[PDB]
Design a protein around this ligand. Structure first.
Ligand SMILES: Nc1ncnc2c1ncn2[C@@H]1O[C@H](CSCC[C@H](N)C(=O)O)[C@@H](O)[C@H]1O
Ligand SMILES: Nc1ncnc2c1ncn2[C@@H]1O[C@H](CSCC[C@H](N)C(=O)O)[C@@H](O)[C@H]1O
Lengths: 178, 285, 284, 193
DNA sequence: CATGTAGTCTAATTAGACTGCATG
DNA sequence: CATGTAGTCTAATTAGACTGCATG
């Protein structure tokens, strides 16, 4: 009803070009590389209430194994979580541009407490998000079969985003709009 | 006053149940010892030698947070992830983020779940072990995810073998100096079956591979028996590691199967040194 | 007055079962001279008895002059190989060829060790072999030893069938064998914790792994967490009556250890034959 | 020490001969009387000690393996072990001072291994006795001093195998082997004329 | 009527002698 | 620059059929 501006932490990913175009002295925190960030460094930066991370898309620009991004994401997410004495809302958001394999996917859903949802793009390109936000978990979306998802990944790996814009919309009502 | 209570233990990658063996010999009462392990040889040793006290829960990746919250609360959380993909002795190591290396994060995951979080100041202790001979970058990542710096303890100071290992944890007195005792066999000669003569006072680090007995790169045998040199027997390795002799004489295992279990486990007197301060916190016999 | 410690000659000693039984009856042993050539056998005895056994190698190398200087002896014990006597071997060569003729080395040294006529001092001997030998091989052993054997089956004081012939002159060799309160008469009592036995008694344990299997059809005698299994070395030692882990030496495989147990004596049987000796020689 | 006594107190030899009879050879050199006490037994399998003692005392125990032929129903080592067994039955008690002799003769049928169990059980190495122009040979174990001391013609082992190879390939020993029983004449009564 | 102090065969599977180099 | 909670490869050992039949 009466809301405050949002404070977003983002890893592995430049988000501000898509954030404020959805309607949000900048309150973003982007960290160059998180092998060296410790607990107090994360909370020395302002208390966030939506942490965000993601893997790079399907391009040969990987100094990391694919699961390095989630493990580091899971680590700093626990740093930014507020104690149960926090009355404001809090969410998180990690997603993979289909870099992870089946063995990496099972580990992802074990560490993130959630089964991911797949979003497609009608034209294609698809994307795989875990996050506690209640809207996308219950959002009516056109489902895809999982062998067509990597029949389309093999076709996208041979030739080697507004898809996230539809998902970040439900954060409208919890934080001041522009 | 309030009497102390029996300790409740979550043991990850339990192996041949070194942790429970040490807790019992320190006289610490154990109410429950829940172990995650998958090697059938490992489990058979633990079931037999502790007579069915251990609760085996299987693959560490099947243990969920709700299991942790109901099986608990836990007072002590111990583990030592596989090192075959971290130790530089393997030129085909897959690093920390792939292979059996990533199993470390299962320990990190469950350690966070067993923690008494904000508000609960009950005593809580944890211990993670791994090798020193790992990559520089993999060492810093383990300590970043565990948010603590390792203490290096070599079993050469309280046993007849070299074994340099890293220990992360919050046990009281972890860096406290290592102290020889009456029951510690410091010399190889005290570890040999009767009639066998030790060449040296120490042996090199014992691993699962049968070349660990040999004293050097130039192949070597550490024992004299009758009119020939000889290898160290697996029964003598048990005494070097500090286990009761014939501890692993179980289920028709060969000496290589048994050396495979020993060469992976903890040195008992090192663990005994680290667990000993727990006697003040929990009920003893 | 004064009993003296026992002086023993043990031919084809194996894993030193004779010395083990003498110690646990409490008989002080002056000398225990053993003839043996299996290096796994010699290692067990050397380790398990901390160097008390004097090993002298091949029984064929032992001369009468050796028996004179090593002696005198109060007890002569042995059990020569049976792989050329037992009918279970279709290629057996008989008593006079192969390893069968090693029996005559026992008969020879037994004579060499007997006290000269005119001496009254106690002198005891014991020779064991298998019941399942040819009828004429049994006759020839009895005529060379001038005694008929007693058949003792270990199934009355142990968890295993083991019908063996015993020649000798120990006091009461033919007396009824009674189970004592320390005998484990059923297979369950010899298993490690958490294991359940199907059968109460196992058939004869030979060196071969098939002998654990029950019947013409193979059969596993133990249940462990609803799964069938074979006997472990540890459990086989207790079936035989040895201390658990007695053969856990020299990195021996489970087949190598079974090879030693499969050739040896049932301990509670030997315990029953040696028990009246503690009146003839010094006690603990 | 097998001492010799004057001639009038020597007695007729009493012979236990096994596996082979030597009655036709002994009286040829005069050890027994003409016409009708040597004891000969072929199958010694169920011979017990009591049998031997009631068979009168013995002065000479003799055994021989069958000559190279089809006559060896038993394994060749059988003849030695049975000989050893019965020999100990026939020994006198170490009190009496009479001369007691024994001898085992091998007609070239025992192989290398059986020869070594032979010398181990009789506690002496054998002597080889030849015949000259190499007709025949025999190996002899015995406590008769003149056999183990006489210097026979040297016969290496490559010739003894050739003799046994074609003696078995073409087929009772000689009369020159009086030197096998000749040394016994001085100890027992000599019968001739 | 089953049994047996074994022995001979194989596939199957282990057991012993090699490669590899980052690290303190 | 000696060391090592290993892995790879191929002579060696081992499970599992079979063989055999005298003996009580
Ligand atoms: N996925 C998994 N879940 C549970 N345990 C596992 C596992 N993968 C490997 N392990 C076990 O983890 C152990 C690591 S070695 C640690 C042994 C133990 N510290 C001791 O003192 O004996 C091995 O025994 C291995 O069998
Ligand atoms: N020529 C020889 N000289 C001495 N011992 C021999 C031998 N040939 C075989 N042996 C040994 O004789 C033993 C016969 S089995 C007897 C074992 C013994 N009764 C026990 O209780 O263990 C075997 O262990 C074998 O190694």
């Amino acid at each position: 009803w009466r809301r405050q501006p949002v404070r977003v932490l983002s890893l592995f990913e430049d988000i501000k070009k898509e954030l404020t175009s959805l309607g949000f002295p900048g309150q973003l925190k982007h960290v160059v590389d998180v092998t060296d960030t410790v607990r107090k460094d994360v909370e020395e930066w302002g208390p966030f209430d939506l942490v965000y991370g993601a893997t790079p898309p399907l391009g040969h620009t990987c100094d990391r194994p694919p699961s390095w991004y989630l493990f580091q994401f899971h680590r700093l997410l626990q740093y930014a979580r507020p104690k149960p004495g926090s009355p404001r809302p809090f969410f998180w958001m990690f997603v993979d541009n289909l870099v992870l394999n089946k063995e990496d996917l099972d580990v992802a859903s074990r560490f993130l407490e959630m089964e991911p949802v797949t979003i497609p793009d009608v034209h294609q390109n698809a994307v795989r998000v875990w996050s506690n936000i209640p809207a996308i978990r219950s959002r009516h979306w056109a489902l895809v079969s999982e062998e067509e998802l990597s029949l389309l990944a093999q076709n996208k790996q041979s030739s080697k985003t507004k898809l996230v814009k539809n998902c970040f919309l439900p954060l409208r009502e919890y934080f001041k709009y522009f | 006053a309030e009497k102390r209570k029996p300790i409740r233990v979550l043991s990850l990658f339990d192996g041949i149940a070194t942790g429970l063996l040490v807790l019992k010999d320190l006289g610490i009462q154990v109410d429950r010892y829940i172990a995650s392990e998958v090697c059938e040889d490992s489990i058979t040793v633990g079931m037999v030698r502790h007579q069915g006290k251990i609760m085996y829960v299987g693959d560490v990746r099947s243990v969920t947070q709700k299991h942790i919250q109901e099986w608990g609360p836990f007072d002590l959380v111990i583990g030592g992830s596989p090192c075959n993909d971290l130790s530089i002795v393997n030129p085909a190591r897959k690093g920390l983020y792939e292979g059996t290396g990533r199993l470390f994060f299962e320990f990190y995951r469950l350690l966070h779940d067993a923690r008494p979080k904000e508000g609960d100041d009950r005593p809580f202790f944890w211990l993670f072990e791994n090798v020193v001979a790992m990559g520089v970058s993999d060492k810093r990542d383990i300590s970043r995810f565990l948010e603590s710096n390792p203490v290096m303890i070599d079993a050469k100071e309280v046993s007849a073998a070299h074994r340099a290992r890293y220990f992360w944890g919050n046990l009281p007195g972890m860096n406290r100096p290592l102290a020889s005792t009456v029951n510690d066999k410091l010399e190889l000669q005290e570890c040999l079956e009767h009639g066998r003569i030790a060449k040296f006072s120490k042996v090199r680090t014992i691993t699962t591979r049968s070349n660990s007995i040999k004293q050097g790169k130039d192949q070597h045998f550490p024992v004299f028996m009758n009119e020939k040199e000889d290898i160290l027997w697996c029964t003598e390795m048990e005494r070097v590691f500090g286990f009761p002799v014939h501890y692993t004489d179980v289920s028709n295992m060969s000496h290589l199967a048994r050396q495979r279990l020993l060469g992976r486990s903890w040195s008992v007197p090192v663990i005994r040194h680290l667990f000993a301060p727990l006697k003040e916190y929990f009920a003893c016999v």
